Amino acid sequence: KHIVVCGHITLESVSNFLKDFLHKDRDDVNVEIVFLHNISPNLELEALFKRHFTQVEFYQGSVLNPHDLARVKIESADACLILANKYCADPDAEDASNIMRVISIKNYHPKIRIITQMLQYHNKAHLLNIPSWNWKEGDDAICLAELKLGFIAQSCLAQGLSTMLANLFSMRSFIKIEEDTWQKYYLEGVSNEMYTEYLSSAFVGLSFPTVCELCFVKLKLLMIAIEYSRILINPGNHLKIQEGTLGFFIASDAKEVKRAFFYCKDNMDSNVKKYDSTGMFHWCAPKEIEKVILTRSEAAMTVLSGHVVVCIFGDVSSALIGLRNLVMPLRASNFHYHELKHIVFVGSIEYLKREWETLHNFPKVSILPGTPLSRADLRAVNINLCDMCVILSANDKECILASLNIKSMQFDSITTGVNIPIITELVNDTNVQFLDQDDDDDPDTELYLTQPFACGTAFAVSVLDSLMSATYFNDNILTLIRTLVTGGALEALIAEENALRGGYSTPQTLANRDRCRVAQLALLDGPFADLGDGGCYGDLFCKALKTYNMLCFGIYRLRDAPSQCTKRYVITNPPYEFELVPTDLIFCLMQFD
C-alpha cells in the first residue's frame, strides 16, 4: 500500500512532507511514501532519509514518462501527490506543467486519486477539461492563491484567524510546557485538529444550535458545520439535522469525536445591480481605473478608519499575485453595504494596473500609487486608523522593512505605531525573527511557535504545505477551509468567464445573503460584560448560541494579562471552565441580519 509524491521534490519539501504525513498517519507501518523526481539522486543528502525513515523510496524518473509510472506502480498507489514549485517566477507555466503531469498520470491509469497544488485560481479551472478528473470521487486541487489570500482576508475580520486555521491542520506534538507563560495556553490551542464525523441518529430532527450545545456540554466537542450537497457553517434554529448528516468538529483527539456518532438518550433601487448573479458577493459596474486612483493629497484630504491597507511590492515584470482572491472574500454578500471595509492599495500603479482587470467589479476599492516605505503615503491613507494592514510581495526584506517602518512611526498626545494591526506575508520562515523586537528568536524553532505567528502577525505559504497531507487523509477538511475562507462557493460560472457577473436581486438570490461571517468580540460593552471577570468560556459560548445563534471558537488574549504592549495571541477552542478576562476578544461566527 503506497502513495507517489512527485513534482517539486526538495530536501526542504520532502522532509517537510514526511513530517506532516507521519504525524497524521495512524498506521504508518503499512504505507510506502514513494518519491519521484528527475534531478539526480543527491545520494549523500538523501540516504539519510532512507535512514531516518523505513517507508520511503526515491526513484530517478519523471511522471511524464509512462515507464516510470509503471516502475513506480501507479496502478496500485492509493493516491499520487503533485507538489508545486510555490515560488516559481512564471506561475502560469508552473501550473500548466502540473496539469500536464495530471494528464500523463490519468492517461496511464484514469482512476488514481490526484492531489495537486495550483498557484493560480484561473489555472485550477482547467483541470475540469480533463475527462478523468473527478472532484466528486476525490481528486483535489489545493489552490495556493485563493487560500493564501483567503486566510489573510478572514484575518482582516478577525486577526489571528489565519494562524488559528493553520494550526488546525498542521500536525504537531504537544511541548508539555509547564510554566505559566503565554506559550502555555497557546500550545494548548494548537493541539486541536479538525475532524469530520456523522451525527448520531439520536440527533435527527433537532436544531443545529441545540445539537451544538449538546456536543459542547456533554461531549466536549466543538461542532462548527454541517453537510447533507454544500457545507453550512454555524447555521441557525430553522435548520434541522436530518439523517446521514455529516458534522465538522474541532477537538484535541479523534477518539472523542466518535462520541458524536454514538449518542444515546423604491422603484429604481430594485433596478440597481448590487450583486453577482448568485447574490453571493457585492458587485458593481466596471469602474475605470482612473476613477479609483488617488493622489497623496486626495487621500490625505479624506480621513479613513476601519479600512484595509494593502501594501504591495512589485513592478511591471512581477508575476500577478491574483489579488481578486483577497478582495472577493471581503466583498461577500453576507456583509451589509455600509459595513464593508474600504480597501486601499499602496504600490506601483504599473503593477496594480494589471490586477485591475479582475478587480473592477468590487465596490470601495482604491489605489494610491506610492510605496509602502513612504511615511507620507502611509500617513495619507491613515494607516494608524486602519483595521488591518496587509503587506504582500509579488514574484522578504522589502516587506519586513515596510512592517518595521510602520511600527517606528509616530502619530497625532503622541502615539507610537507599534500597536497597529499588521499582517506580513513571508516567503522564508527563518526570517520571521525580524518582525518584532521583544520576542525570543531561534533560527530552527519551527514557525508556528514564534511570537509573530502565534499572534497572527505573520503568514507564510509554507503553512499551506501541510494542507497537502491533511486533504489526503480527509477530503472534506479542504472543502470546509475553502468554504469558510473564501466567503462562499458558484465555482462553475467563474470557471467559464473568469469574472463575476452582476445580476438583479431576486428574493432567491437575496436568500444567499443569509450565511454566517467571521467576527471578533469585545467583553467590555457587550451583553457579556459580566462574564468578563473570571467567567467561564463555556457559559459565554452557551449564552452566545442560545441567545444569538452565534458560535464561538476561541480567544484572542493579550500575551501580557503591568504593560503597554497590546499584542494578542490565539487560543483555539478552550475547555468549558476556561477563565475569561475582561480585555479578551472572542472568535465567533455571527448570523446575518
Minimum CB distance to Ca ion, residue 124 (Å): 36
Assess 92 for contact with Ca ion (CB under 5 A).
Answer: no
From residue 435, give the alpha-carbon distance in Å to each of 88, 116, 297, 399, 424.
Answer: 25, 32, 30, 10, 9
Options 146-154, 215-223, 431-439, 567-575: segment touching Ca ion (CB under 5 A): 431-439
Minimum CB distance to Ca ion, residue 566 (Å): 17
Minimum CB distance to Ca ion, residue 429 (Å): 13
Size of the site for Ca ion (CB under 5 A): 3
Q: Which is nearer to Ca ion, 253 or 440 (CB)?
A: 440
Q: Which is nearer to Ca ion, 304 or 391 (CB)?
A: 391
Minimum CB distance to Ca ion, residue 457 (Å): 11
At 23, is the secondary structure helix, strand, or coil? Answer: helix
Assess 539 for contact with Ca ion (CB under 5 A).
Answer: no
Question: How many other C-beta atoms lie within 10 A of the C-beta of residue 256?
Answer: 14
Options 140-148, 270-278, 434-442, 536-544: segment touching Ca ion (CB under 5 A): 434-442
Minimum CB distance to Ca ion, residue 433 (Å): 5
In three-state form (DSSP H/G/I as H, E/B as E, the rest C), the secondary structure along 169-232 is HCCCCCCCCCCCCHHHHHHHHHCCEEEEEECCHHHCCCEHHHHHHHHHHHHCCEEEEEECCCCE
Question: How many other C-beta atoms lie within 10 A of the C-beta of residue 573?
Answer: 27
Options 36-44, 341-349, 426-434, 554-562: segment touching Ca ion (CB under 5 A): 426-434
Strands, E assignment, 242-357: 246-251, 275-276, 308-313, 343-347
Minimum CB distance to Ca ion, residue 421 (Å): 18
Options 46-54, 147-155, 438-446, 475-483: segment touching Ca ion (CB under 5 A): 438-446
Chain-centroid distance, C-alpha 390 = 14
Helices and strands (DSSP H and E) totals, the chain: 22, 24
Q: What are phi and psi of 11, to 5 degrees?
A: -35, -40
From residue 156, give the alpha-carbon distance in Å to each of 271, 308, 312, 327, 342.
Answer: 32, 7, 16, 11, 11
Minimum CB distance to Ca ion, residue 406 (Å): 16
Q: Which is nearer to Ca ion, 182 or 537 (CB)?
A: 182
Q: Which is nearer to Ca ion, 273 or 407 (CB)?
A: 407
Contact of 257 with 220, CB cutoff 8 Å? no
Minimum CB distance to Ca ion, residue 404 (Å): 11
Minimum CB distance to Ca ion, residue 393 (Å): 20
Q: State how far the Cα of 112 lies from the Cα of 138, in Å rounded to an integer.
A: 10
Q: State how far the Cα of 581 lies from the Cα of 248, in Å rounded to an integer.
A: 29
Assess 439 for contact with Ca ion (CB under 5 A).
Answer: yes
Options 235-243, 310-318, 440-448, 462-470: segment touching Ca ion (CB under 5 A): 440-448
Q: State how far the Cα of 280 lies from the Cα of 270, in Å rounded to an integer.
A: 17
Q: Which is nearer to Ca ion, 328 or 454 (CB)?
A: 454
Minimum CB distance to Ca ion, residue 438 (Å): 7
Q: Which is nearer to Ca ion, 382 or 457 (CB)?
A: 457
Q: Which is nearer to Ca ion, 387 or 441 (CB)?
A: 441
β-sheet bridge partners, residue 248 = 196, 225
Options 17-25, 268-276, 428-436, 569-577: segment touching Ca ion (CB under 5 A): 428-436
From residue 56, give the alpha-carbon distance in Å to each of 25, 113, 310.
Answer: 14, 20, 43
Options 70-78, 435-443, 486-494, 529-537: segment touching Ca ion (CB under 5 A): 435-443
Q: Which of 92, 357, 398, 441 is the binder for Ca ion (CB under 5 A)?
A: 441
Contact of 196 with 248, CB cutoff 8 Å? yes
Contact residues toward Ca ion (CB under 5 A) are 433, 439, 441
